[PDB]
Design an enzyme around this catalytic site. Structure first.
Site, PDB file in Angstrom:
ATOM      1  N   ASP A  45     -10.692  -0.075 -53.303  1.00  0.00           N
ATOM      2  CA  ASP A  45     -11.137  -1.402 -53.683  1.00  0.00           C
ATOM      3  C   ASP A  45     -10.353  -2.440 -52.911  1.00  0.00           C
ATOM      4  OD1 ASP A  45     -11.873  -2.972 -56.882  1.00  0.00           O
ATOM      5  OD2 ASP A  45     -11.386  -3.880 -54.925  1.00  0.00           O
ATOM      6  N   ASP A 105     -17.261  -3.935 -51.571  1.00  0.00           N
ATOM      7  CA  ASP A 105     -15.838  -3.688 -51.393  1.00  0.00           C
ATOM      8  C   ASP A 105     -15.261  -2.726 -52.430  1.00  0.00           C
ATOM      9  OD1 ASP A 105     -14.331  -6.671 -52.877  1.00  0.00           O
ATOM     10  OD2 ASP A 105     -16.032  -5.428 -53.485  1.00  0.00           O
ATOM     11  N   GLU A 106     -16.082  -1.777 -52.850  1.00  0.00           N
ATOM     12  CA  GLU A 106     -15.652  -0.774 -53.800  1.00  0.00           C
ATOM     13  C   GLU A 106     -16.347   0.531 -53.436  1.00  0.00           C
ATOM     14  OE1 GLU A 106     -16.765  -3.619 -57.152  1.00  0.00           O
ATOM     15  OE2 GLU A 106     -15.117  -2.544 -58.093  1.00  0.00           O
TER      16      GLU A 106
END
EC number: 2.7.7.7
Length: 333
Positions: free
Chosen positions: A7, A94-95
């Protein structure tokens, strides 16, 4: 299963800081019209009007919203993560979730080391700091990542699970709303454990029902939902019709064209397809279908053609100004 949850740290904000080294401290709000910690610390959030924030700290810069760059930056890191996983499930921009069980034949200590590497590497290539979590399933991998989101590296080992679960609060669990959490803390449910004191209906009535099964499962550490080699990021292509109509011989060719392009802009069979029909008002009318299978250009046309008919059996008097498609859950590799 040894899941690793990656993350990126206040991504948009950290990306800017990277191009604009200036602000290598300076409280930066990442704005979107039509935000990193230093500014976030001063009560700044995401989802509450820009007004307040940069009012509540006008000293805070409100840098532009350059999502195409956050995207090219996120596409690069994700590919850097694919090489390191028997399989990867890109969550958002973004994970990601990596299942590396085999890249390390089930050895937990070797996963923590891998994570320490992946953390490193993304730094030598994109110079970005990420916060990862190494744990038995995905839910624990995430929950532990957050408990040290500031460039952390949480680790919940197989044998320290039932413990961790005991001292786990309600306000630290994904999917539960803060509004719903506040309700649960009023009824006296402070720890995930206390969930077991109530009896299901008392719980379903409050939480969703799906969250009830979720919490309960989590509670007993049953919830071992797999990592699916697939991207949850969607992509859609829509075309404007010559003129607004309700024909079909006319609309369909213009839907298949939207299908072909959404298909060219994706990297693997989509598992869901959605026919978006924008109509004469200006106003949406959708309906798609998800296949576990994987789909394919073939049935895409066929199935699209059906969802389209239905939409045409859904609003009448209303012609159609633009047909589109929204592919999602792209099975990759």
């Amino acid at each position: 299963m040894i899941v690793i949850f990656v993350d990126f740290d206040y991504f948009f904000a950290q990306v800017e800081e990277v191009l604009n080294p200036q602000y290598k401290g300076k409280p930066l709000v990442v704005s979107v019209y039509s935000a990193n910690y230093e500014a976030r610390k001063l009560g700044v959030k995401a989802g509450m009007p820009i007004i307040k924030a940069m009012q509540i700290a006008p000293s805070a810069i409100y840098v532009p919203m350059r999502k195409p760059i956050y995207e090219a930056f996120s596409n690069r890191i994700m590919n850097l993560l694919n090489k390191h996983a028997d399989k990867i499930e890109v969550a958002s921009i973004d994970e990601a979730y990596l299942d590396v069980t085999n890249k390390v034949e089930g050895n937990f200590e070797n996963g923590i080391e891998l994570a320490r590497k992946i953390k490193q590497e993304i730094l030598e290539k994109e110079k970005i700091t990420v916060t990862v979590g190494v744990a038995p399933n995905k839910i624990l991998a995430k929950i532990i990542a957050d408990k040290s989101k500031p460039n952390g590296l949480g680790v919940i080992r197989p044998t320290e699970v039932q413990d961790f679960l005991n001292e786990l609060d309600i306000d630290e669990i994904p999917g539960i709303g803060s509004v719903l959490a506040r309700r649960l803390n009023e009824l006296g449910i402070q720890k995930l454990r206390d969930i077991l004191s109530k009896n299901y209906n008392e719980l379903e009535k409050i939480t969703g029902k799906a969250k009830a099964l979720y919490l309960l499962k989590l509670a007993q550490n049953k919830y071992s939902e797999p990592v699916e080699n697939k991207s949850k990021i969607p992509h859609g292509r829509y075309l404007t019709l010559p003129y607004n109509t309700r024909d079909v011989k006319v609309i369909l060719p213009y839907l298949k064209k939207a299908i072909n392009e959404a298909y060219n802009k994706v990297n693997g069979i989509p598992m869901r397809i959605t026919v978006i029909a924008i109509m004469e008002d200006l106003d949406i009318l959708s309906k798609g279908k998800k296949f576990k299978h994987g789909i394919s250009i073939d049935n895409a046309y066929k199935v699209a053609e059906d969802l389209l008919r239905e939409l045409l059996v859904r609003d009448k008097r209303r012609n159609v100004r633009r047909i589109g498609v929204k592919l999602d859950n792209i099975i990759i590799n």
